[PDB]
Amino acid sequence: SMEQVAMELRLTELTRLLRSVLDQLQDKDPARIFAQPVSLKEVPDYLDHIKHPMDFATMRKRLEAQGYKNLHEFEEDFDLIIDNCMKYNARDTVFYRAAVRLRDQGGVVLRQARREVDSIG
Numbered sequence: 001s002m003e004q005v006a007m008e009l010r011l012t013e014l015t016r017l018l019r020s021v022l023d024q025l026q027d028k029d030p031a032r033i034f035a036q037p038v039s040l041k042e043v044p045d046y047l048d049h050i051k052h053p054m055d056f057a058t059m060r061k062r063l064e065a066q067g068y069k070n071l072h073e074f075e076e077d078f079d080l081i082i083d084n085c086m087k088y089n090a091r092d093t094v095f096y097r098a099a100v101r102l103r104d105q106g107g108v109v110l111r112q113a114r115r116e117v118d119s120i121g
Contacts, residue, residue, distance in 0.1 A: 010121075011066050011069070012066070013120070014068065014069075014070070014071075014117070015063060015064075015066050015068070017113070017116060017117065017120075018063055018068055018071070018074050019063060021074070021109060021110070021113050022056070022059060022060065022063060022074075024109045025056075025078060025102070025106045025109055025110075026056050028101070028102050028105040028106055028109075029056070029098065029102055031094075031098055033085075033094075033095060033098045033099075034055055034056050034081050034085070034098070034099075034102065035055060035056050035057060036055050036056075036057050037053055037055045037057065037058060038050070038053060038055070038088075046088070049087070049088050050084045050087065050088055052080055052084070053080075053084060054077050054080035054081045054084060055081060056081070058077075059074070059077050059078070059081075062077070070117075071113060071114060071117045075110060078106065078110075081099070081102075082099045082102060082103045082106075085098070085099040086099050086100070
């Protein structure tokens with residue numbers, strides 16, 4: 001149908017916008033602490049601690065498959081990155097501190113993304 005096409009164009013444009021959001025968020029992680037999944041070879045107990053692991057490479061795979069239907073779903077995954085880290089790592093660690101700075105810097109980006117998503121529809 002023509003409606004299915006129109007819906008698919010909307011999704012494609014959301015994906016375009018979320019790709020730019022993702023790039024902007026990942027720049028706030030210059031140490032690349034959150035770039036890849038926590039290695040289960042190197043942290044064999046991880047899944048005992050963290051039930052839903054997340055990282056920027058995993059988000060990028062979902063994004064490019066157009067797997068985010070709305071900004072809420074994308075933000076859920078970003079919040080998992082931060083929140084998983086802040087639980088697994090102690091306050092005095094470079095990992096925890098990286099997550100706090102990512103959260104704080106990312107908020108600004110996500111605030112305007114939400115306006116753009118609502119604005120453009």
